[PDB]
Amino acid sequence: MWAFPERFEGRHVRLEPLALAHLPAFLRHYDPEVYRFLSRAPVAPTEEALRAHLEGLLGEPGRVNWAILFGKEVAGRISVIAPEPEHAKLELGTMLFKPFWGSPANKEAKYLLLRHAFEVLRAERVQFKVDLRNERSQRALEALGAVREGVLRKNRRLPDGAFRDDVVYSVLKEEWPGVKARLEARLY
Amino acid sequence: MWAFPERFEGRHVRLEPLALAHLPAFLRHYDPEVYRFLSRAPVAPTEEALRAHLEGLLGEPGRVNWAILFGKEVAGRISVIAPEPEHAKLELGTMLFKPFWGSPANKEAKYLLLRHAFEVLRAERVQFKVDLRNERSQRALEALGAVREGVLRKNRRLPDGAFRDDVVYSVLKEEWPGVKARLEARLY
Numbered sequence: 001m002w003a004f005p006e007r008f009e010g011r012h013v014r015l016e017p018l019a020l021a022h023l024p025a026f027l028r029h030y031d032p033e034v035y036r037f038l039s040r041a042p043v044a045p046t047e048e049a050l051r052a053h054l055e056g057l058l059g060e061p062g063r064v065n066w067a068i069l070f071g072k073e074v075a076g077r078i079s080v081i082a083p084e085p086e087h088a089k090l091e092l093g094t095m096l097f098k099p100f101w102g103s104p105a106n107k108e109a110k111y112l113l114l115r116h117a118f119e120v121l122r123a124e125r126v127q128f129k130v131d132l133r134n135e136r137s138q139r140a141l142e143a144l145g146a147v148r149e150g151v152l153r154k155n156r157r158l159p160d161g162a163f164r165d166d167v168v169y170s171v172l173k174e175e176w177p178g179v180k181a182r183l184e185a186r187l188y
Numbered sequence: 189m190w191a192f193p194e195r196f197e198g199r200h201v202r203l204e205p206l207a208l209a210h211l212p213a214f215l216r217h218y219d220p221e222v223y224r225f226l227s228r229a230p231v232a233p234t235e236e237a238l239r240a241h242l243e244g245l246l247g248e249p250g251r252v253n254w255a256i257l258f259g260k261e262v263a264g265r266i267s268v269i270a271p272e273p274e275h276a277k278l279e280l281g282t283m284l285f286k287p288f289w290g291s292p293a294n295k296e297a298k299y300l301l302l303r304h305a306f307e308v309l310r311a312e313r314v315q316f317k318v319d320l321r322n323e324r325s326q327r328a329l330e331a332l333g334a335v336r337e338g339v340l341r342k343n344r345r346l347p348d349g350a351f352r353d354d355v356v357y358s359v360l361k362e363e364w365p366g367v368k369a370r371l372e373a374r375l376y
């Protein structure tokens with residue numbers, strides 16, 4: 001199994017293990033648009049629904065999550081999803097609260113995880129999955145230099161029964177230096 | 189959870205639960221080319237390696253496997269991989285022994301599973317993953333009418349440490365009638 005650090009310290013953000021103690025931040029910044037392109041989106045603007053969403057993140061097998069601290073606030077979270085040491089690959093996903101969109105929080109959170117994945121664990125592949133209707137995230141991954149591999153059609157079903165398409169992106173280890181350079185240019 | 193039939197009866201083949209009792213067929217028809225584009229390929233032309241490969245198929249969580257009987261011989265196997273009732277999707281994969289390549293065994297095995305997946309379980313999506321170097325299987329999926337969604341680069345690592353790319357194909361439920369028609373034209 002791969003071991004990850006509990007905490008990361010960046011120039012703009014710091015990361016620490018995501019926990020139930022972070023629930024208050026999710027309750028202080030609830031906005032439907034933030035969860036609309038995520039599976040298991042809070043089913044209602046209530047503490048019970050947001051608690052269920054947070055517990056789902058913390059309970060997915062193999063998933064490792066960090067709260068992203070920006071200044072003195074929790075800006076959102078970043079997740080290592082389905083890490084597979086045997087194939088030297090993993091998936092990464094983030095979610096930021098609306099007020100922090102546009103801040104450097106998301107890029108540095110990714111920068112920090114990607115560096116550990118590629119340089120320390122030496123993963124060969126990191127992938128990202130974005131809802132095809134989520135154009136903001138698609139532009140951000142294209143800006144990061146991630147390669148668009150294609151669209152998994154009807155790859156997830158919503159609770160009302162409708163289906164969503166997942167756009168799959170990846171960064172391979174040989175591509176990390178170039179991606180890393182673009183992230184540093186924008187963060188430092 | 190979805191329930192599948194233990195047996196299927198086609199015009200050219202019949203399917204029954206894959207089991208250790210089928211090991212003899214794997215030992216009677218060993219050819220490296222048959223396993224070269226599969227993960228966990230038998231590590232040696234020996235009963236011990238083929239037994240490990242068969243037990244790996246039978247032990248993968250959620251995987252359901254059938255021996256394909258062609259005439260009085262086992263022609264290979266077909267597998268439902270990672271079925272996910274919640275998202276109405278699954279992956280399907282087959283492996284046929286060399287002597288049966290070109291027979292109707294593979295198409296009817298797929299025909300039988302696809303019909304149950306789409307018409308009875310009402311899955312919305314069935315996907316297939318093929319090694320990018322496996323051109324025979326890519327041509328067969330294109331002949332079946334499956335949609336090539338893209339290439340998951342370095343999606344699996346071999347035991348020697350080399351990486352393989354996976355080409356991802358799918359058939360959606362709305363496309364099944366057309367695919368079904370092409371399969372019936374060639375089988376009946």
